[PDB]
Amino acid sequence: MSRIEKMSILGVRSFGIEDKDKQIITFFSPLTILVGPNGAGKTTIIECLKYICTGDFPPGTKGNTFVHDPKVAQETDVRAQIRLQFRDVNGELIAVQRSMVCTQKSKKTEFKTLEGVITRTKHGEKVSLSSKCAEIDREMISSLGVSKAVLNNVIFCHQEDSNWPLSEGKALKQKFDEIFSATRYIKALETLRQVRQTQGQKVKEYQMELKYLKQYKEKACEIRDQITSKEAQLTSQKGYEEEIIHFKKELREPQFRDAEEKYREMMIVMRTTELVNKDLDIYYKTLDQAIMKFHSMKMEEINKIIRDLWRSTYRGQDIEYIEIRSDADENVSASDKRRNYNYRVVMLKGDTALDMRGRCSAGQKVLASLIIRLALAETFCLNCGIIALDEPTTNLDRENIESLAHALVEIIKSRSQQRNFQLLVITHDEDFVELLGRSEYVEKFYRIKKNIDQCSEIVKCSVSSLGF
Amino acid sequence: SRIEKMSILGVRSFGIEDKDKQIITFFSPLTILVGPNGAGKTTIIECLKYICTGDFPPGTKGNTFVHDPKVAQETDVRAQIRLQFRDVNGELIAVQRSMVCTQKSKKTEFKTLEGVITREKVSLSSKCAEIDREMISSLGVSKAVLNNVIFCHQEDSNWPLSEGKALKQKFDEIFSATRYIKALETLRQVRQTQGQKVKEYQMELKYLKQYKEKACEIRDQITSKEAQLTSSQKGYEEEIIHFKKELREPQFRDAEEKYREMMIVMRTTELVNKDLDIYYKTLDQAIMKFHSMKMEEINKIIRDLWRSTYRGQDIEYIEIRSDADENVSASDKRRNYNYRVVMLKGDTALDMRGRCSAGQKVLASLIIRLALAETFCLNCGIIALDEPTTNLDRENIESLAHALVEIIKSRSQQRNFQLLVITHDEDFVELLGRSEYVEKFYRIKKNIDQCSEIVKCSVSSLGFNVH
Amino acid sequence: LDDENTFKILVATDIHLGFMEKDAVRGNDTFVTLDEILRLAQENEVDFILLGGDLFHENKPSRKTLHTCLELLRKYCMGDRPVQFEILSDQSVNFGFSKFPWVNYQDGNLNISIPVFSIHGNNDDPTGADALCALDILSCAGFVNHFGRSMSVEKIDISPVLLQKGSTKIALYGLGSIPDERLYRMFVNKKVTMLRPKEDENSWFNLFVIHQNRSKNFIPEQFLDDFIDLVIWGHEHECKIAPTKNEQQLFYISQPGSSVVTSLSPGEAVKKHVGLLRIKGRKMNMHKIPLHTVRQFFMEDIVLANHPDIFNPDNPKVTQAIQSFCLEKIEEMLENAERERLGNSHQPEKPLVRLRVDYSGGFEPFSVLRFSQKFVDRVANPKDIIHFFRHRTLRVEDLVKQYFQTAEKNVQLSLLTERGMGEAVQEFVDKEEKDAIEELVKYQLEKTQRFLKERHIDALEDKIDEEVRRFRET
Amino acid sequence: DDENTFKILVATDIHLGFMEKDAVRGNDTFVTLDEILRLAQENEVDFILLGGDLFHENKPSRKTLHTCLELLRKYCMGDRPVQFEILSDQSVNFGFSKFPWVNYQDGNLNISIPVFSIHGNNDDPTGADALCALDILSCAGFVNHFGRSMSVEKIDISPVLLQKGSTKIALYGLGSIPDERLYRMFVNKKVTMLRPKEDENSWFNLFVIHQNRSTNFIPEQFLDDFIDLVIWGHEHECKIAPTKNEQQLFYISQPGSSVVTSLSPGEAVKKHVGLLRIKGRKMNMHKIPLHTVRQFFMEDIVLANHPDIFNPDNPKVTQAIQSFCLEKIEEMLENAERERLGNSHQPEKPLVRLRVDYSGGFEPFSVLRFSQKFVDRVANPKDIIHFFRHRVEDLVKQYFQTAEKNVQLSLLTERGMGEAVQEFVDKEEKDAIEELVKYQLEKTQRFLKERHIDALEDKIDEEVRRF
Amino acid sequence: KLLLTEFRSLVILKNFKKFKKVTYPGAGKLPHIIGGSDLIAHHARKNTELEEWLRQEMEVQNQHAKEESLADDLFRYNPYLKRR
DNA sequence: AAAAAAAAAAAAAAAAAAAAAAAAAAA
DNA sequence: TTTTTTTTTTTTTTTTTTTTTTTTTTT
Ligand SMILES: Nc1ncnc2c1ncn2[C@@H]1O[C@H](COP(=O)(O)OP(=O)(O)O)[C@@H](O)[C@H]1O
Ligand code: BEF
Ligand SMILES: [Mg+2]
Ligand SMILES: [Mg+2]
Ligand SMILES: [Mn+2]
């Protein structure tokens, strides 16, 4: 039970900076349609939602780019704020805010977040807590009931960041161990790898120095032998004594007085470091195997979800089903320069399993990513039934568009009962909208446009008695 | 230059047996490809690109391109692609590049066999490089243009909005100056190798200097003790032979000359490293200046096309700007590239990449491709638009249709122009001169065995496969 | 018996024209069934046709759909047969949305044999600033009398389409397809109103046509007013053309159903019927008329968990048993459909077969891709034959600890002790020391190096690792 | 006139629904059609002869169809008598309908002014059933769609024979075929016109054709001389006054559009609908100006032909150009105000377009800022001003020479690295660079060691300076 | 530069329109129009159970509006601690 | 004329360095 | 409060490793 109620965008990308340009958008249930021209600001709303929820900017965008550019504004600095109002899992009303500043300095530009505010209503009164962008995450991550990884990837997936299930092995593995909440074990594994490389470099340097220390050791031993022989000769001759004194002085140089001790110590340290390296390799292999077993065991019931979703949705007698499958590398070691990640979405073309990456179409990739996101939303976003589809009908033909509309209608029916499901749809296709709205869920939709000053504006429109 | 026929066999979902050889005939000036998702529309453009330049689709290594030997339940899948077309002069040429994907153990071997060139009807076996150059010469455009402007993949279609290094590689392959960047890489690698050698040699230098100092101390002792012996006692004779043994030792025998030679090499490599740094900086500046000079001309085309096509009032116009790094050097670990498509919101210029919308990005990519086709595709008037209206809104779809119709009208004045479109939009096909140009379109579907077929359909059944 | 005081009304509902018009098998089903409906209206000499809504499947019907609808309406609903009933109602408030606010048969330039009175369904509800629907186009052409459309969002006041043939009198109340939650809000805010004739109110039939969801939000059937005598109900495709009266509502509820199979619901397998209504003063007699052009739809539901006799979850060859059972069920359904196809020649040869298999006791669905390949040219829904569905802990720490203990006992650690690196990794994960692994490695290295130095061991690898093993064992 | 006079209102390109979603520009074609129907009703015309393109879109929206239906019902239906006959076989003239008769001959339709129309290319029949919007209109019963092409292979034109009293009219018609196809049919002698064998010379023939006039040209030579008045379409320049070419014995009428669809300089002339009066073989065409058609003023300016105010390399010419454009658009916005008096039906906001052509090197100003000034004065603020226009080796050599003459070369000889890179580029020698670097060190190092240098850090540098 | 012209037999106050308005009972007579004033908003007797359901859902609506008012005033809250 | 062993080029994808903001002292 | 140094994330360029191609060198 968590719903995003209303937003306030100011100074974000193409939105205006004066307080008279503060745009407010109220999300309806169970369907919210956003329409507008290219560059109007539809995707900026989801970007603001993601930034409020988790504090991460859109992909490829740093702080300098997310906020309005001071140069276009003809202003020294620009201060942006985003205000979100929502209910946490228990239904209590919470409003959060995040401030922002971009200062135009010389050629580059500087970015900085001001302290944000957490506001609730306790005992009929109003409270405010200025927080530092790290309590306005943890706290509202706990309030929303879902983790940062799912909020970034499943629910508020950016339009550019979509089709992330069909990404490289390491990227997919990273997405799925942030989703599975096991990032710290991979951190420990990489710490093991790094310490192994450090100890290996130390071993190489120790061998290099050991060569010279062996040379020194043998030369000093020969000097000592000649000293003892000369003393034996003398004790049984002033020049003999002078030679003896000179050889003692040759024993007196720092690289000869301390000769045996350094060689012994360096031998012990290199051998112990080598044994530690072997044991570290063993432990790293074991931990990697355990992590890839856990991954496969938690993708067991999502693959099981993904299969049914793909069989219901995809209109084609081509792929039986698709599933995510991972496979650990048998011949892996902590000393390897490049690791191998077998984390791929697999297509079941007949009775044989292929790899979807580089082998599917654009529409198939879009549908597979949508199905994977919906399965992950079913598995993890149980307490926060929100999903934002940014042009889900991209590269989808007529039959798949209709089937996706039917599947989304079924999801709405199955999740709106005793729970709140908010499907935010930003589309340019009126047919998809009509297909979803045939169940009569849409009464008002938001049309994002721009004024004469080219600042984004959000205005609520009506399907009936008003334009569409 | 125009393309007439294509024959696809054993590529992706196309069938392996000789009964599944699909044939597609390209019309002029507009050819429409329609069909369900995962049917073979984009595979046709992929086959065209592969037969033109030999390059596989992005992300494909050649073993995911041929029909999986497993789904065929075979141990080998022989794949053939043919393309009958006309070169710039107007002669008929057909190339028949082939390949196999042998299946062994858990891996999947791949290799390409010798294709042929037909010209009266003279067919000769040829290697991949020779057919590549021959078809590049016949079509009249460079391989980079063929890969990026004409037959770019549906995924590699927003390449002008890519990172600085990738955009620079695309544009210096487009401008035909890749050998100079190859020379830049050679210079950087030479400087890095010499720097590493200098580091190791200076590590050895101190040791060598210490050995030399010990040798000099031994020699001074030899001289003093020899003078003492000449002045005159037995021990003054014993220490002499021991000192001669010490000087006899190779570590202290020729330490001076070795240390001198190593220092000479050291200083020499230092000044050579400095010189190579200056030369690398100069050549980088020259390359960036050449890029700016050769790209300012197409900036005007990009500006005018954006002003005509883009219906919004956000961006006045877009262009592309390259700025050389002032403080560049061959010893730098990481270089910074400043290739960027730039949008001008009013009077200030901004970085379009990461700061634009999806529709703005796709429209900008389309404008860049059309400008590069105006500049370089004069000889080969073909452009394949794989779902051009992917993210465009209604007004921009209409404006793009109008611009494409104007391009068709203008560029058909003396040479054939083809605008192969893959789409799921009925309205776009309509507005793209549906009555004027398209009479027969192509439907790509799949039979009961899930092998792609290419069938010619009259325009009466156009709406059955598009929405 | 049809006197001069009888109201023969052909009550159709949810024709759903243009549904799957792009299909090669089911393209012309809806048009043919509408042709049959109009033929029944023409043959029965009905006074007027009363469509219950959803006459079109799409909000904006295609050109073929509109052209076919106009062709059929001109062929059957236009003629020189005189109209037998009056209209004593203010025609500028019932049909007064168009610039021709009068019933179509009364236009001085149109000769209408069978008037058509219809409401708009939610698949063809008005949209846009002008608030137009497909029925608006039909009424502007002059073939249909679109009535009952709401004008104001805040409140709705419906005006009866008063009709009188001889002695009998009908008040034809009609409501459009308002969104279900919005109409619910109107019904609970008392923002709905039914205007009854002011005098003789007890001498009208008060026939009400409504297109909304029922017991299926849902507009319950008790919110409706108690003066009604019949309620035609659309947005419900399971035919119930037979009028049904609940315990206390004082009105009858008729559910004509649909003219085509839109969804594959269990309630959609009922035989489709079109009504033949008769009114004589106050009494009603609805006679059902089967449609012989409606494609058959047979379905079966099987739950594999509730058949332990044959379906054994642990059977390694149970998937082939599932496939064989499904094949036998589909064959039986097809044979049953064929046995019923010899009664009439008008039903389409290919039927609609659906088989929902519920696997929940750890069963694996078979190849639905190839199972449906055995009925490519024998069923009308080749892609949708079998539906597989399921009706609606693990901690990484235990797994990594188990793996660590298993590894320690299957290989021999050389320097670090047992159960030390496991707890170091656990500390790094939980307490976030971010230095536990390095600290442990350095501590063990320095300890063993100090022991080796103070033990006075000569510099040779074999003795070094022998004393290392001795320290590890101790 | 009298009982033996045919009165025909010829409006050709209504283009209903054009810019319907537009705010200012919407609801214009509907009002113009209302005016046309009002003129038809007032003049008591026998029938209306539309020339095709009655709808802008191939599938008109609901608003367009509803408005057309309501206007046709209001004006073309009533109790007024019909005074002419249909002597032709109604099954062939209007037979692609389940009702193959004329609409006023139907026993259930009262038609005062029957409408005879052809289909344009903007609303040509599409789909499996080959239906157009005029098919929907004819099914409703308000329009007599005639002249549809049944066979793709050949064209047979059968006229809708008319007769009012003594006068006889043969009403040939032909919907818009794709222009290249139709041209190929005409060349292949596959177009035929079937004339009555009774009273061959007593019929006044008139052809209603909706095609291009200026392969896509279908000129006037491709029409026989037996006809006498060819009404035309797909041409919006209002030439409603008939013309007779010396080579062509048949008149040509071009009523033109009832709205400004494109901003071409062929829609700036006033639009008229023609009141025609045949009386035997005597025709009298009288134009009637449209008082509700939005005004269109436009001028073409070429900046390269004014070498007196527009200096090509003037640093502040970009403001003189803007001033000239501002003064121009202002005389037109005023010539519009001065010309709008009296015509109360004229829309307040006119259409102003300026085409600016530059080739001397002018830089277009901010078209957004210029269009921000006239926003509530022109009906098309977005489209006010149009702006349009009708090497490595040497550069690297120059840059290397500049670098050599700029900074002090340490050890590499002058013009060494440049030749090395040039050899690497053309000869593709990959070792052309390393070889030179190594060969310079090896040489100068030798030179240094022969002189047994003292290896002092700065003394070796002086030795290299000697080089 | 011409067209094929071939001849066939196509021929197969005063009026030629075929239309007679088939009279409807009440055509041309006094229009006894019923509407406007004589259209009253009738009621629904007692219907306690129906009254109970309507009142309960009205209370639900009132509670929802109460929550919505709290939402609105929470959003309009100016951030006092916005100095940072 | 054919095999095969080895060296070179490509590229997909993991690795890493520079930039910038956040956090943590730190006065 | 502000300064200054250290951490962490991102992102965009770099490096690696396997595969294919090609070269050569033999049979
Ligand atoms: N920092 C910025 N300053 C000004 N305008 C910006 C800035 N960043 C992005 N924009 C512009 O603001 C708009 C953002 O709209 P967006 O949400 O991406 O579009 P859409 O809703 O069509 O997907 C685009 O026109 C973009 O170029
Ligand atoms: F699936 Be395809 F790219 F439309
Ligand atoms: Mg977007
Ligand atoms: Mg594709
Ligand atoms: Mn035209």
Author numbering:
A (entry chain A): 1 to 236, 1078 to 1309
B (entry chain B): 2 to 120, 125 to 237, 1078 to 1312
C (entry chain E): 7 to 222, 227 to 402, 426 to 507
D (entry chain D): 8 to 221, 226 to 401, 428 to 504
E (entry chain F): 653 to 664, 682 to 753
Q: What did the original publication write about this model?
A:
The MRE11-RAD50-NBS1 (MRN) complex is a central, multifunctional factor in the detection, signaling and nucleolytic processing of DNA double-strand breaks (DSBs). The core MR complex contains two copies of both the ATPase RAD50 and the endo-/exonuclease MRE11, assembled in an elongated structure. This structure consists of a “head” module which includes MRE11 and the ATP binding cassette type nucleotide binding domains (NBDs) of RAD50, and a “tail” module formed by the coiled-coil domains (CCDs) of RAD50. Furthermore, MRN/X’s nuclease is highly regulated by trans-interacting factors that interact with a regulatory surface patch on RAD50, denoted “S site”.
The highest resolution structures were obtained by incubating MR or MH129NRN (nuclease dead mutant, hereafter referred to as ‘MRN’) with 50 bp DNA and ATP at 35 °C for 30 min, followed by addition of BeFx (producing the ATP mimic ADP•BeFx after ATP hydrolysis). Our structure resolves a single NBS1 polypeptide (651-754), which wraps around the MRE11 dimer with the highly conserved K683NFKKFKK690 motif situated across the two-fold symmetry axis. Intriguingly, the very C-terminal region of NBS1 (718-745) forms a continuous helix (“C helix”) that bridges one MRE11 catalytic domain to one RAD50NBD in the sensing state. The first part of the helix binds MRE11 via a hydrophobic interface between L719NBS1, L723NBS1, W722NBS1 and F233MRE11. The second part of the C helix is bound to the N-lobe β-sheet at the RAD50 S site. Here F744NBS1 binds into an S site pocket lined by K6RAD50, S8RAD50, I24RAD50, R83RAD50 and Q85RAD50. DNA interactions are virtually identical in MR and in MRN complexes. However, the highly positively charged C-terminus of NBS1 (K751KRRR755) binds the DNA emerging from RAD50 and induces additional DNA contacts on one side of MRN. During 3D classification, we identified two separable conformational states in MR and MRN, one with the MRE11 dimer symmetrically attached to both RAD50NBDs, and one where the MRE11 catalytic domain dimer detaches as a rigid body from one RAD50NBD. In the case of MRN, the detachment is only observed at the RAD50NBD not bound to NBS1. These observations suggest a stabilizing effect of the NBS1 C helix-S site interaction on MRN catalytic head dynamics.
